[PDB]
Design a protein around this ligand. Structure first.
Ligand SMILES: CCCCCCCCCCCCCC(=O)OC[C@H](COP(=O)([O-])OCC[N+](C)(C)C)OC(=O)CCCCCCCCCCCCC
Ligand SMILES: CCCCCCCCCCCCCC(=O)OC[C@H](COP(=O)([O-])OCC[N+](C)(C)C)OC(=O)CCCCCCCCCCCCC
Ligand SMILES: CCCCCCCCCCCCCC(=O)OC[C@H](COP(=O)([O-])OCC[N+](C)(C)C)OC(=O)CCCCCCCCCCCCC
Ligand SMILES: CCCCCCCCCCCCCC(=O)OC[C@H](COP(=O)([O-])OCC[N+](C)(C)C)OC(=O)CCCCCCCCCCCCC
Ligand SMILES: CCCCCCCCCCCCCC(=O)OC[C@H](COP(=O)([O-])OCC[N+](C)(C)C)OC(=O)CCCCCCCCCCCCC
Ligand SMILES: CCCCCCCCCCCCCC(=O)OC[C@H](COP(=O)([O-])OCC[N+](C)(C)C)OC(=O)CCCCCCCCCCCCC
Ligand SMILES: CCCCCCCCCCCCCC(=O)OC[C@H](COP(=O)([O-])OCC[N+](C)(C)C)OC(=O)CCCCCCCCCCCCC
Ligand SMILES: CCCCCCCCCCCCCC(=O)OC[C@H](COP(=O)([O-])OCC[N+](C)(C)C)OC(=O)CCCCCCCCCCCCC
Ligand SMILES: CCCCCCCCCCCCCC(=O)OC[C@H](COP(=O)([O-])OCC[N+](C)(C)C)OC(=O)CCCCCCCCCCCCC
Ligand SMILES: CCCCCCCCCCCCCC(=O)OC[C@H](COP(=O)([O-])OCC[N+](C)(C)C)OC(=O)CCCCCCCCCCCCC
Ligand SMILES: [Cl-]
Ligand SMILES: [Cl-]
Ligand SMILES: [Cl-]
Length: 544
């Protein structure tokens, strides 16, 4: 074992980090090893300014180190040529230089050099060169002097972008170029072009390559965006199980490009004992803004046989979307639907036609089980008999998911859902538009959609208002395995002045499996004389 002495602050920290690279307690020499320790100490001290120390050993081994005289900064001379002499980023860097008199750190010199080189790369100074770069160390004066003469040249500007291998018409790609021809080069614009192209889903691969062979004389940099068409068909499946609903299967078939206009088609189905759906979604990007703006035409079929609800539904939807890179989506919707249903003893055929608006956003960082993220969705729908709809109503909805991680190991998932349907003919409203609570992602511990007001005969009727929330805490026990504890609470009522909150609580497991996060929850109803017994759930739940 070895020990130091004679170092006060950071000096005793850097030396300790330098010594913990060679093995201490070991069968080793006593005049060849203490020569290895000596070289290390002097190197850690040299980096912090002390060039002329003194070290000496006794016996466990101890080493009396003395810092000695430090070399100070005598001059940080730097001259800049080209656009750098007047460039704000280069000017800003010149202040980072260490003041005269301060103790020398060799890291500051080489890092200043890295920064000169880094800014040139970022801002397109592709003719940048050091004409001089030297650090003079004068031990006689105990002074160090920079001497850098750096010539950046002039900024390169963007040329034309030529695309290769695209199955999509070129005009769509040109309208995704975030810069104008002639704009001053900026590295993040290339990154943004790559991002935008990839985000369309049109391509298997995207590589934007600058053509330096040409831009040497003109200082105008043409780009070549070579792409490969996306796989024409993709099929994802998914399976889940819950004690109340039973097994559940989802499958989606994506055709991320249907033609050279960049249209895409998604066919989806969700199958369980009580509910079955089949949906189609056809997307048509607008030429002016192919990524941010598009039309959606959706058509769907649904069948429900659940509790006191029997229903079959058909719907068509036309939507106009405005998406932002910030994550916000904004849409105007126009929905038509036909619903044949029986709720309790009430049977009806209802045709609806109504517009609506939707605002949403989803953010995520950390992968499939994100460490941080959130999702928000707010919508308003308005049906009116004046334009052919069978029922007058207004539906307001809001939902939130918030995910945050503390100290790498403590993950908090918070959810909240609000729903309000205002109408004077509730009996004609299809069950799908009414509110029921209970079940996973509603109130765990209660049966799927079992919570709602009832007809006089005891049959479920559905609610005109919905309020639910959940607090969940997860702890990363080991590796990819987490323990979870949660409480869910909410109500589905038709008179908000008359509360009837139901609360469920439970514990669970989470596993970051190769195919994504797998959850397992056990849950019971809390303080309910009418409801007892454990519900459990297993699946690939998304959280957000
Ligand atoms: C009574 C009958 C009970 C049977 C139901 C048991 C269901 C248990 C499923 C638990 C794992 C879910 C995996 C999943 O749900 O999915 C993973 C996989 C690929 O999924 P991927 O994302 O690679 O595509 O799906 C395929
Ligand atoms: C709820 C959904 C409602 C359906 C909405 C559909 C709306 C469709 C309107 C637009 C049609 C496409 C316009 C178009 O561009 O047409 C031509 C296009 C080919 O053009 P191209 O220049 O690539 O030539 C080929 C490439 N080459 C020249 C290099 C060889 O052909 C195609 O897109 C043919 C494929 C289009 C099929 C769409 C199927 C929709 C129905 C799904 C089922 C829903 C049931 C409820
Ligand atoms: C590659 C795509 C894979 C899709 C998924 C594969 C099939 C998964 C079946 C899972 C069934 C287990 C759950 C179950 O028990 O569910 C029962 C359900 C209806 O049973 P039920 O009416 O006798 O009584 C229903 C009412 N009660 C039970 C209260 C009396 O079963 C059904 O709906 C069966 C629906 C079968 C659909 C056949 C495939 C069409 C896919 C087209 C679109 C694909 C786009 C990607
Ligand atoms: C809501 C839909 C909004 C419009 C979708 C726009 C769209 O995706 O337009 C694609 C295409 C345009 O065809 P186009 O001949 O006007 O110009 C083609 C170019 N060219 C004359 C030089 C050969 O539309 C088609 O193929 C048929 C579009 C279906 C009608 C809606
Ligand atoms: C309603 C009609 C709005 C008309 C304004 C022009 C919309 C547009 O065609 O272009 C501007 C901008 C594109 O988005 P931006 O990137 O300026 O933000 O409109 C927007 O954002 C408008 C978002 C509309 C959300 C409706 C819910
Ligand atoms: C925006 C207004 C333009 C569309 C109005 C369609 C409409 O106003 O269409 C009323 C139609 C007869 O009205 P009615 O007295 O049968 O109810 O009915 C319907 O169902 C129309 C079904 C919706 C397609
Ligand atoms: C219990 C939850 C514990 C959360 C742990 C917070 C960790 C530090 C904040 C990290 C962050 O990033 O904090 C900013 C975030 C909004 O992020 P932004 O990007 O909108 O700005 O602040 C937030 O409170 C996130 C929303 C959490 C609200 C859920 C608690 C409601 C309790 C009801 C009873
Ligand atoms: C249900 C919510 C549970 C949240 C648990 C979060 C635990 C976070 C521990 C973080 C340790 C970091 C280690 C560290 O570096 O330093 C210790 C750290 C301060 O930093 O210590 C702390 O954060 C002390 C945190 C004290 C949290 C107090 C929670 C009381 C719950 C009582 C429940 C009673 C039920 C009947
Ligand atoms: C945005 C995220 C918000 C997260 C909020 C999570 C709330 C967690 C509830 C914890 C329940 C306490 C335990 C209990 O057992 O509490 C019983 C008691 C009613 O029992 P009682 O006296 O009838 O017998 O609790 C009640 O009433 C309390 C009912 C609380 C539900 C409120 C949820 C509204 C959030 C939606 C906002 C969405 C915005 C987009
Ligand atoms: C690593 C992988 C671990 C996966 C397995 C976790 C351990 C649990 C396995 C036992 C579950 C079991 O064999 O059968 C399920 C059973 C159902 O109960 P029931 O009332 O429906 O029927 C009872 C009969 N009767 C209705 C007539 C009264 O449930 C129970 O036994 C309740 C078990 C509660 C376990 C709590 C787990 C905490 C995990 C913390 C996180 C660690 C990371
Ligand atoms: Cl268009
Ligand atoms: Cl809608
Ligand atoms: Cl009814």
């Amino acid at each position: 074992r070895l020990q130091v002495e004679g170092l006060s602050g950071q000096l005793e920290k850097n030396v300790r980090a330098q010594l913990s690279t060679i093995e201490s307690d070991e069968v080793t020499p006593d005049r060849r090893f203490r020569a290895r320790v000596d070289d290390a100490i002097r190197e850690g001290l040299k980096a912090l300014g002390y060039y002329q120390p003194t070290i000496e050993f006794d016996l466990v081994l101890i080493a009396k180190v003395t810092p000695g005289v430090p070399v100070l900064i005598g001059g940080t001379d730097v001259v800049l040529r080209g656009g750098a002499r007047t460039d704000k980023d280069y000017l800003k860097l010149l202040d980072t230089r260490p003041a005269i008199g301060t103790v020398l750190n060799q890291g500051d010199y080489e890092n200043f050099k890295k920064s000169l080189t880094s800014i040139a790369l970022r801002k397109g100074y592709f003719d940048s060169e050091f004409t001089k770069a030297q650090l003079g160390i004068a031990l006689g004066l105990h002074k160090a002097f920079w001497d850098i003469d750096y010539n950046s040249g002039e900024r390169y500007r963007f040329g034309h972008v030529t695309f290769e291998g695209s199955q999509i018409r070129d005009e769509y790609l040109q309208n995704l170029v975030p810069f104008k021809e002639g704009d001053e080069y900026e590295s993040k614009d290339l990154a943004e072009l790559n991002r935008r192209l990839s985000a369309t889903g049109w391509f298997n691969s995207v590589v934007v390559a600058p053509q330096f062979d040409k831009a040497r004389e003109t200082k105008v940099l043409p780009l070549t965006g070579v792409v490969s068409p996306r796989t024409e068909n993709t099929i994802e499946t998914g399976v889940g199980y819950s004690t109340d609903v039973g097994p559940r299967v989802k499958a989606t078939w994506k055709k991320p490009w249907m033609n050279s206009y960049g249209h895409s088609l998604t066919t989806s189905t969700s199958i369980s004992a009580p509910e079955q759906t089949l949906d189609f979604s056809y997307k048509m990007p607008l030429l002016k803004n192919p990524l941010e703006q598009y039309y959606l035409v959706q058509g769907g079929f649904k069948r429900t046989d659940l509790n006191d609800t029997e229903s079959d539904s058909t719907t068509l939807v036309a939507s106009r979307y405005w998406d932002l890179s910030s994550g916000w989506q904004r849409a105007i919707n126009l929905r038509w639907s036909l619903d044949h249903f029986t709720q309790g003893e009430i049977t009806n055929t209802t045709m609806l036609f109504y517009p609506g608006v939707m605002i949403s956003r989803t953010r995520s960082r950390g992968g499939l089980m994100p460490t941080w993220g959130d999702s928000q969705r707010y919508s308003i729908d308005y049906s009116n008999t004046a334009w052919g709809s069978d029922v007058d109503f207004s539906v307001f909805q809001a939902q939130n998911v918030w995910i945050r991680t503390l100290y790498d190991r403590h993950r908090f998932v918070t959810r909240g859902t609000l729903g309000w349907i205002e109408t004077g003919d509730f009996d004609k409203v299809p069950p799908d538009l009414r509110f029921f609570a209970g079940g996973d992602r509603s109130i765990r511990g209660y049966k799927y959609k079992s919570i709602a007001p009832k007809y006089a005969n005891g049959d479920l009727k559905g609610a005109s208002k919905l309020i639910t929330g959940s607090l969940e805490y997860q702890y990363n026990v080991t590796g990819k395995w987490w323990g979870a504890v949660f409480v869910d609470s909410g109500e589905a009522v038709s008179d908000i002045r008359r509360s009837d909150f139901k609360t469920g609580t439970g514990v669970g497991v989470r596993w970051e499996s190769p195919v994504g996060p797998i959850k397992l929850d056990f849950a019971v109803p809390v303080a309910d004389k009418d409801e007892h017994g454990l519900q459990f759930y297993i699946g690939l739940g998304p959280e957000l």
